[PDB]
Amino acid sequence: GPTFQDVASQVFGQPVGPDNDGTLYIFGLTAKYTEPEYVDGRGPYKSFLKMLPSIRWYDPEHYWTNGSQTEGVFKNEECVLCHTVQTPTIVNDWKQSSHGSKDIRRGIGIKKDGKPVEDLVGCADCHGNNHQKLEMPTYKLCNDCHPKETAEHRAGGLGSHTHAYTVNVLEFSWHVGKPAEEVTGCAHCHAIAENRCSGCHTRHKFDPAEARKPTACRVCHMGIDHDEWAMYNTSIHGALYEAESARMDWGKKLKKGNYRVPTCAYCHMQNGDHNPQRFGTIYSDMGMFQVDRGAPKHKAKRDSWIKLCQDCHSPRFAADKLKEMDAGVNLSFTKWREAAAVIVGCYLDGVVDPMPEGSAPDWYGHYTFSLLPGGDPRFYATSNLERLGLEMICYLTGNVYKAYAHMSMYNQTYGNGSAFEQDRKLVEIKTEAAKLRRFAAIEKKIGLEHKSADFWKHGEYLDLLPGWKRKPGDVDVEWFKRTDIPHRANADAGVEI
Amino acid sequence: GPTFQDVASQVFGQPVGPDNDGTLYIFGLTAKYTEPEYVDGRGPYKSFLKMLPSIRWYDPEHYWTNGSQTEGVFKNEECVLCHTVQTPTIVNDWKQSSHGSKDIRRGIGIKKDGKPVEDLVGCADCHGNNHQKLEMPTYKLCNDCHPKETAEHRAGGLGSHTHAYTVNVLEFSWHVGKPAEEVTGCAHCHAIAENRCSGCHTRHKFDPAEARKPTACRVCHMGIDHDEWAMYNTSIHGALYEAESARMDWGKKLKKGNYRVPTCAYCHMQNGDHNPQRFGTIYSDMGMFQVDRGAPKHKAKRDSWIKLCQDCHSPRFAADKLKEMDAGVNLSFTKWREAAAVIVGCYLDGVVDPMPEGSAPDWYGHYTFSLLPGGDPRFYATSNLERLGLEMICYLTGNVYKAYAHMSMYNQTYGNGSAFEQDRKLVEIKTEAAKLRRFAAIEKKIGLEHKSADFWKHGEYLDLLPGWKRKPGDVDVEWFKRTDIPHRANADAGVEI
Amino acid sequence: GPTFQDVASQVFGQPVGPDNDGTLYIFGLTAKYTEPEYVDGRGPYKSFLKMLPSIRWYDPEHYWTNGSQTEGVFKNEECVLCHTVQTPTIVNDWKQSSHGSKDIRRGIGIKKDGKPVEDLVGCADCHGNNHQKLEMPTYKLCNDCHPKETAEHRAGGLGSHTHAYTVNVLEFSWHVGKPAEEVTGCAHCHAIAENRCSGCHTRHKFDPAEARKPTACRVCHMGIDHDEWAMYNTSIHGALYEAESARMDWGKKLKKGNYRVPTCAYCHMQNGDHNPQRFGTIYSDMGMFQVDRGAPKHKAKRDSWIKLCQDCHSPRFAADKLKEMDAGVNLSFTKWREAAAVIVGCYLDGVVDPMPEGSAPDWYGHYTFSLLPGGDPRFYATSNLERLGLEMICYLTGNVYKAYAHMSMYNQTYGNGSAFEQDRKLVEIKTEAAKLRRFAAIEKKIGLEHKSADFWKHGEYLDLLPGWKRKPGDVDVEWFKRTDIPHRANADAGVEI
Ligand code: HEC
Ligand code: HEC
Numbered sequence A, B, C: 001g002p003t004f005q006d007v008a009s010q011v012f013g014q015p016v017g018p019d020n021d022g023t024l025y026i027f028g029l030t031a032k033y034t035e036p037e038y039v040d041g042r043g044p045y046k047s048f049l050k051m052l053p054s055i056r057w058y059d060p061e062h063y064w065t066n067g068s069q070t071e072g073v074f075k076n077e078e079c080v081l082c083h084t085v086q087t088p089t090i091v092n093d094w095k096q097s098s099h100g101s102k103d104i105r106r107g108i109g110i111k112k113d114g115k116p117v118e119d120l121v122g123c124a125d126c127h128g129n130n131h132q133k134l135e136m137p138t139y140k141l142c143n144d145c146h147p148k149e150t151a152e153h154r155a156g157g158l159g160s161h162t163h164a165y166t167v168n169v170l171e172f173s174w175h176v177g178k179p180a181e182e183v184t185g186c187a188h189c190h191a192i193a194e195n196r197c198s199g200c201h202t203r204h205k206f207d208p209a210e211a212r213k214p215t216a217c218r219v220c221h222m223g224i225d226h227d228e229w230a231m232y233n234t235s236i237h238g239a240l241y242e243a244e245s246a247r248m249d250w251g252k253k254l255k256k257g258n259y260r261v262p263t264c265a266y267c268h269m270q271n272g273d274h275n276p277q278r279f280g281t282i283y284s285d286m287g288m289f290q291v292d293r294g295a296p297k298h299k300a301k302r303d304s305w306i307k308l309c310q311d312c313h314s315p316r317f318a319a320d321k322l323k324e325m326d327a328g329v330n331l332s333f334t335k336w337r338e339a340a341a342v343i344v345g346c347y348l349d350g351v352v353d354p355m356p357e358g359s360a361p362d363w364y365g366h367y368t369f370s371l372l373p374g375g376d377p378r379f380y381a382t383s384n385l386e387r388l389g390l391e392m393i394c395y396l397t398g399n400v401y402k403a404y405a406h407m408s409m410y411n412q413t414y415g416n417g418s419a420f421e422q423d424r425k426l427v428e429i430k431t432e433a434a435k436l437r438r439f440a441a442i443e444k445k446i447g448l449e450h451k452s453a454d455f456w457k458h459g460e461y462l463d464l465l466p467g468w469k470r471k472p473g474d475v476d477v478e479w480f481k482r483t484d485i486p487h488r489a490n491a492d493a494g495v496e497i
């Protein structure tokens, strides 16, 4: 019996075929999905988690292998001579780095194995001398000569660069719940933050001045679920950054009195601290958890922030601005709690369409409401009501905090992730709930037995989801028993975390 | 009987508590809203309008009080010596300002009380000498020495910087209709524009070159309801600004022949005019009111714009571009009028869900349709149909004008605030109306008496709204009787404006 | 019988009048639409296609006429002397161009009619000497002296600058289907790309260094249907561009080793090639057509891209990144095919509201489902289901490709045009389909004969659409018979293309 592709083929006169064969498929209609080559993912869901093979660059300790065609054992200078031709910009970068140029060194006292590093740190020093045994480093290499910065980079808790990949990719519902090729960018964004030292000061220049700029953060620290770049950019600080970036001195260390305009790094890597999370009052799951940072119990952290602001402001002004945040955040949660009551009420009254049993199982293998304890809050493969709910708490409520934290007058109120966007989302949620309730009331009165449509449960994409193949004993709970890393409180973790 | 918080508490094992106590509330579910400390707002709705106390910085004439812990009467140089340590960037800014550095003065002839100002204008000159009686200035201070710029800053009409706060915060429906902490950024954005001289050339450098850049405007002149920054930025002018900003001479006055690339200030503060509103053809409520700026009655203003463009263009080309605006704007209103007919038709047929009596009262205390005379057009605490209507007229239709005015080919057509966004919004409006009509038709036929859900009327946020507490005699109509400021035509103004 | 305007007039106390008379119409409610002055459009739909007269600047060969008031025959230097006063920036630009300044010439060997061009190329050389017979050039002028660049500019296929206007304005459904003043920016954006040489290096400086910057492309290469600027900008390449733009050497030709940071022009105008389309693997209708660019048949193009990336990367790394694109793209089409099945299923079951006969005819004059062969896929004047479908394939699916092509980790996954936006759009589509099916099921059971509302078919804007006036013989099929340009496969082309 014909598939969608089969029928499309009969209509468009293009044969059905595999997506991967190079055919230009008209609106992709007659193409069949082919699973890409995978490698096994790590972590507690290693029984089914996959990665694309290009994970080799980002978790090289577990995936890196020789894939070079060039043979030989070479000295540093030979690496440079050939790569001047073969990858010129890498050499140009390296020649403009302190590693490759003594002229710009600052005599900071770098040591390896207790001995001063006075030579060039060349290609072979970081990648190995044998071209068939090249190394793809992590912070572990950098630790050899930069232990202070590495220790700090490794000092964060859950929600920091430190466990971005190990915990918050490998344990994370939205990542583990999707086909690997859909979420490659998630693995890499989070893995760059954790495993590398090049997220802010990029290879191969490794220039701290570059790392001080907002461009060192905004590729990752952006978007609908954590819009801090946009919040910063739409503050007067951000406008002044844009106004002054071209002519200001970026060569100054991030210290009181060295900058007129504060950047991400100025406020979050104060005095060059490589554990930027630590200045935060408390981890709040991106502002989805409500906390009044101006409460007496958080006075030390609030006072610290006020003192940071006092580099360039009255501390009274700074205190007032952070109180505005506290107040704005508290007001924002009234709208979320309204939304949550409406949404859960629909579920409890059994009027959500689809109900959980009418959707594909969640990534746990459960037919459980996403906005209930044990559920999987999400924006995909779920009801419209649940999607809107997730958007309310994650995209909007969380970002109200970010808007206030970063002094974006517009995004606190009108703009993306604002009070007024919350208002509109709340209307949408109530609209969905109202529709659901009216349909159910009508169907009950006329004795129409409504069944949710099959497209909520099955489809070309839905059928790929891991929920379908979850089975008892498929969780590596020993991973969750580990105490050397934090963990996410997943429903099927099976142990104490 | 249990509240949402109570039930959540029983499920999540986290006690109910006040939002402000510092507890990290899981999804904010068990937190209770606590009203922040307020001060009374000013204006015609002073009987219930509130502000957060941090309004002290932005309407200091009515709210500023001593809040310093430092005592003493100091000379200018003493301010500097201590603040070099205590707020270094303020001192650094000031030292780089003409106020604090004679070397960059231009001999413009500044006078105070008819006498030339030849000395430094120091911290104490602007803030006072007594640290327990420090002053937080407005344009009134600046007027002492810069009467021309101040007079112009104070010469605008409604819709200008001049009355941004006094009228368009204190009289404005969306501001007065919401809890104060929700709209702090509104008060401050508008108050910075009105009461300060630092919106464009920031303190403490007060650098006109900074004020010439689009960064001097875009923090405020952005977003879904007035997207002129995005419109400018997505024009060739805006692209050239980005291309040339780093190397161009920003030290030149905004005059014909001094710039290749026009900025906001170039076109709207022509020849340094500090009443930027005046170059506009006519105030149109952000493009929500339809006016053909190319009509004979507006020839003087159109000719003036053409002559401005002629700094760098054929006047025929400029005339053609502004005619494109006129035509594009006129076409855009056909879609709004379509939407309005659909929406009002739903109300007149009584098929909106909720109907106004099913929602919380509007900020006037009325159960009145928002898109009818006397109603309160809005995006919050209203029906989905009404929300979509407001979005159509304000977010989209108004911004089509901005897209054309600023030569954004993309945003005129495809992009944010465009013709095609209007198209999609119109489909959405018709979709909502269609759903409403189908439900009503079904319910009528089967004799189901539909009542709008209680969540349209009551909820944790909805219950905070001022509409609930409005009562006869709660408007200060004497404020509206004032002829020394313009006014908004509010439904409960009670007098002639 | 009263129109909307008539009724509004009785309520607001503002007379009905033509939109163009200069009246400030309250919410545009009582204004009547007046058709702007048009000129006839060119192309196969010339029988009804219109343009605003300002098309004169963009298709000057067919529309340019004298419109100057200045008389005289002048020498180059006289043009300059007067225009120094009359249009100073044009002269300033020209004086800073190689055309107007021998000092910055590079001796490249420019010839006209086989003879070296050693003089200044002045205003009169490009525009003519007679001020009543001034010329408005296209690439045809530039060809006189820059044949190589012009030939390349003219070497592209469909989907390139080369036919942007001639084919993809004049034959394009969304353009020909709308009133001319609505889509002026479409005509001009596409005409600037095709007919001019100033899209990237603007007049009158014609500076290649400017053309190398992303600002040379992003005014056009942006937005919801082709967001490559945003994709680039949210890649590490884009962040580094922003970090380095102010201080980097933009005077270097776009060659291996000359740049650390790649721009649009670096990758798509490799070695100064003025046919940027040619580096693309295959034209895929902006990613709406599915093709695996990593398939064996595309090896040459894939290898070429890998070698380009190898300017600054391992070719293995580059190969891996482009494989990530292939995989991400293939996954993205599963969601589109899901959506398409749901949407077409609704049509085949006759439950779309409106059905095509309930909407205004499409621009062909047909009452045909937009997402069926022969239909007109669109976001306007169609059902909500069809609008959402178009958004899914065009705005989202197409941009997933762009997100991967440009290394935007965030926009591949979370952001604009991402996997997760596809997820949410798919929920929306299923939500619309579910609603449609539930209404139809209820109406069938209770014997309610539902007719789609008249507002789907008629309205102030809908009534302006060309579909209403289409008639047999109104297509210039001789245009489509042309073999010297490619064509769009329009339903009423009437001949082989
Ligand atoms: C240590 C200080 C390094 C030196 C010296 C050089 N490289 Fe490097 N390189 C380094 C790291 C830590 C990484 C991993 C990625 C990251 O950002 O952390 C890399 C990566 C590469 C790659 C692959 C990535 C790519 O862009 O293709 C190549 C091909 C590479 N490095 C080559 C290279 C050459 C030729 C060098 C000498 C001129 C060189 N590297 C210096 C760390 C270090
Ligand atoms: C100082 C003026 C800041 C600048 C510049 C930027 N941010 Fe910030 N950030 C700042 C504050 C006062 C806060 C609230 C912290 C508190 O505990 O009160 C934040 C918050 C964040 C967060 C969340 C941190 C947390 O929840 O603990 C992030 C991830 C963040 N900021 C990132 C960030 C980026 C990327 C910035 C540049 C674009 C940036 N911040 C600017 C202070 C300041």
Ligand code: HEC
Pocket: A108, A139, A142, A143, A146, A149, A150, A151, A153, A161, A193, A196, A197, A198, A199, A200, A201, A208, A209, A211, A212, A216, A252, A253, A254, A255, A265, A269, A270, A271, A272, A273, A274, A276
């Ligand atoms: C962004 C979050 C960063 C990450 C991740 C890493 N570094 Fe960094 N680094 C960053 C900034 C903003 C600065 C300048 C800080 C300042 O005070 O101005 C730096 C600086 C360094 C330095 C120079 C130290 C010195 O004594 O001058 C080194 C040696 C350094 N960084 C190393 C380093 C290592 C080893 C990292 C991984 C563990 C690493 N950095 C990550 C920003 C960021």
Ligand code: HEC
Pocket: A159, A168, A169, A172, A174, A175, A183, A185, A186, A187, A189, A190, A219, A220, A221, A222, A226, A284, A285, A286, A287, A288, C409, C410, C413, C414
């Ligand atoms: C960079 C381009 C990112 C991509 C892609 C993904 N996310 Fe992310 N993540 C990013 C940042 C900067 C932040 C921190 C914001 C803050 O205020 O802390 C986040 C955080 C989330 C977290 C925490 C969510 C929580 O418990 O509240 C997790 C678990 C997470 N990110 C994982 C993750 C994965 C795997 C993604 C794809 C499925 C997703 N992120 C996209 C930026 C990066």
Ligand code: HEC
Pocket: A312, A313, A314, A315, A317, A318, B079, B080, B083, B087, B090, B091, B094, B099, B121, B122, B123, B124, B125, B126, B127, B136, B137, B138, B196, B197, B198, B203, B204
């Ligand atoms: C007049 C020309 C001024 C001089 C000289 C100095 N300041 Fe000022 N300051 C001025 C104004 C008009 C304002 C109000 C805010 C605005 O933008 O209009 C301020 C503000 C302050 C503040 C509070 C705001 C903050 O950022 O914390 C402080 C603490 C302050 N000013 C201090 C200060 C010092 C120490 C000065 C001498 C070095 C100084 N100001 C000069 C106007 C003027």
Ligand code: HEC
Pocket: B214, B217, B218, B221, B228, B229, B230, B232, B233, B237, B262, B263, B264, B265, B266, B267, B268, B277, B279, B280, B281, B282, B283, B284, B286, B287, B293, B301, B305, B405, B406
């Ligand atoms: C000249 C090339 C301009 C530049 C640069 C910017 N704007 Fe503009 N603006 C311009 C015109 C011709 C118009 C239409 C005015 C008319 O009467 O025809 C506008 C409109 C505005 C408005 C609305 C003004 C009104 O309705 O009276 C605002 C608020 C505005 N522009 C702001 C603005 C900003 C913030 C800009 C930089 C980002 C900017 N404009 C650029 C001309 C030009």
Ligand code: HEC
Pocket: B108, B139, B142, B143, B146, B149, B150, B151, B153, B161, B193, B196, B197, B198, B199, B200, B201, B208, B209, B211, B212, B216, B252, B253, B254, B255, B265, B269, B270, B271, B272, B273, B274, B276
């Ligand atoms: C943005 C809307 C501004 C506001 C609000 C204020 N100023 Fe301004 N100022 C602005 C610009 C763009 C410029 C340069 C204009 C030009 O022609 O290039 C200026 C300049 C000044 C100057 C210098 C005047 C001179 O003779 O050189 C002064 C003294 C000045 N501005 C003062 C001033 C005052 C007192 C303000 C509040 C009343 C004020 N400015 C507001 C932009 C803007």
Ligand code: HEC
Pocket: A409, A410, A413, A414, B159, B168, B169, B172, B174, B175, B183, B185, B186, B187, B189, B190, B219, B220, B221, B222, B226, B284, B285, B286, B287, B288
């Ligand atoms: C700066 C960050 C703003 C915030 C926050 C708010 N608005 Fe605003 N306002 C802003 C600008 C630049 C404009 C002018 C746009 C133009 O084309 O004129 C506006 C204008 C509105 C107006 C006029 C609306 C009308 O009658 O048509 C008012 C009444 C208004 N703004 C008030 C207001 C308040 C109080 C806000 C929160 C409730 C809101 N604005 C956000 C920019 C600033």
Ligand code: HEC
Pocket: B312, B313, B314, B315, B317, B318, C079, C080, C083, C087, C090, C091, C094, C099, C121, C122, C123, C124, C125, C126, C127, C136, C137, C138, C196, C197, C198, C203, C204
């Ligand atoms: C050829 C190399 C040129 C020279 C020398 C000058 N101009 Fe030009 N101009 C040229 C072209 C190809 C165009 C069409 C637009 C495009 O971008 O392709 C133009 C346009 C104009 C216009 C109208 C457009 C406008 O911005 O108003 C004018 C008024 C104009 N040009 C005037 C002008 C003057 C005075 C010149 C000498 C100083 C001059 N141009 C030089 C190409 C060329």
Ligand code: HEC
Pocket: C214, C217, C218, C221, C228, C229, C230, C232, C233, C237, C262, C263, C264, C265, C266, C267, C268, C277, C279, C280, C281, C282, C283, C284, C286, C287, C293, C301, C305, C405, C406
């Ligand atoms: C190199 C690092 C690039 C930069 C910088 C930019 N783009 Fe790109 N683009 C690049 C690749 C590898 C691809 C995929 C091509 C393939 O066949 O695999 C693309 C794609 C595009 C397209 C579509 C081309 C097509 O489908 O044939 C466009 C229109 C495009 N890119 C434009 C563009 C712009 C405007 C950029 C700057 C903002 C830009 N690209 C950057 C490589 C690179």
Ligand code: HEC
Pocket: C108, C139, C142, C143, C146, C149, C150, C151, C153, C161, C193, C196, C197, C198, C199, C200, C201, C208, C209, C211, C212, C216, C252, C253, C254, C255, C265, C269, C270, C271, C272, C273, C274, C276
């Ligand atoms: C963007 C897509 C462009 C369009 C359209 C046109 N040009 Fe261009 N041009 C562009 C770039 C990025 C560059 C620099 C390329 C490099 O290798 O760095 C150029 C350069 C030129 C030159 C200089 C050639 C030389 O020998 O140095 C010329 C003479 C030139 N361009 C002419 C030209 C003409 C005639 C065009 C229309 C047919 C044209 N360009 C369009 C970018 C773009």
Ligand code: HEC
Pocket: B409, B410, B413, B414, C159, C168, C169, C172, C174, C175, C183, C185, C186, C187, C189, C190, C219, C220, C221, C222, C226, C284, C285, C286, C287, C288
């Ligand atoms: C510049 C400001 C644009 C506007 C306005 C319009 N479009 Fe466009 N068009 C633009 C670009 C950069 C691209 C290329 C993207 C790529 O990846 O190739 C497009 C492409 C479309 C195409 C092809 C659609 C197809 O068959 O798949 C056409 C037909 C098209 N553009 C036409 C067109 C018209 C006439 C518009 C208004 C109705 C529309 N575009 C807006 C950028 C420009």
